[PDB]
Structure formats: structure tokens, C-alpha cells
Amino acid sequence: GKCGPPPPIDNGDITSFPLSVYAPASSVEYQCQNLYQLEGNKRITCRNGQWSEPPKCLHPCVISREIMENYNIALRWRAKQKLYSRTGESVEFVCKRGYRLSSRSHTLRTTCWDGKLEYPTCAKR
């Protein structure tokens, strides 16, 4: 019932010293790299010669100056804001000077989720 190494996952790995073979009833813990967010079971187990299903690392979002330019918006915090936001982080925007929030836009704060971030839209006053 021994297992080989636990499955590799993209953008993350186990937190322990690696073994080449694992006894049944072993477990391991995964961590995702900094900018990524674990989804699934952080700890998996070797039973019946197999590993239970490893988790996934959800992607950060890269803020787009071009979409902001097209939608007539700007960051609320231009000096502070990192280019990469994590899954689950929100970004706050403002309309550019002399523009106002469109009626069918979202409002000025959106949330990053596994590489996708929506943006609000403003229209000229």
C-alpha cells in the first residue's frame, strides 16, 4: 500500500522534507507560492496505494493599464497599488477627472479571482 511522491501541483508544493516512498496512512501538506491561493484540501493522504486529490493554486491578477485607459478609470491608490493582486483581493478605482460612473458598470471596487479581475467603466460628464 506504499505510495510514491505526492502529485506535483502548479505553483505550489509540499511543506515537508520529501520522501521517495510513503507508508500507508502518511499525509502531506501543500502550500501555494506567495501570490497564489490554495483551493481544495491542504492535507492529502496515502491510502490503498494512492494519494487523495491534491489542491490547486489559484492565480493572481495582473492590473491592466490598457483596460483602465479604455474604461476611463484610474486606481484609487496609484502610489500604493501592486501590479499583482491575489485571488480574493479587491482593487479600488476612481473615474478619471470629468467622467462619471456608468449606470450598467459595476461600482468602483472589484475582486481578483484566479487571474480574472473585472473593471468598472466611466463615461464623460
The coordinates were experimentally obtained by X-ray
CB-based contact 38:55 (threshold 8 Å): yes
What domains can you pick out in the chain, each with its CATH number? 10-59 (2.10.70.10), 60-125 (2.10.70.10)
Measured distance CA(107)–CA(34) in Å, rounded: 28
Distance in angstroms (rounded) separating the CA atoms of residues 44 and 30: 8
From the list 91, 98, 54, 58, the residue with the least C-alpha distance to 76 is 91
Spatial separation of the C-alpha atoms in residues 51 and 1, rounded to whole Å: 11
If phi > 0 it is left, if psi is from -120 to 50 it is alpha, else beta; for residue 35 that is alpha
Cα–Cα–Cα angle for 66, 59, 122, rounded to 5 degrees: 30
- Phi, psi (degrees; rounded to nearest 5) at 37: -125, 125
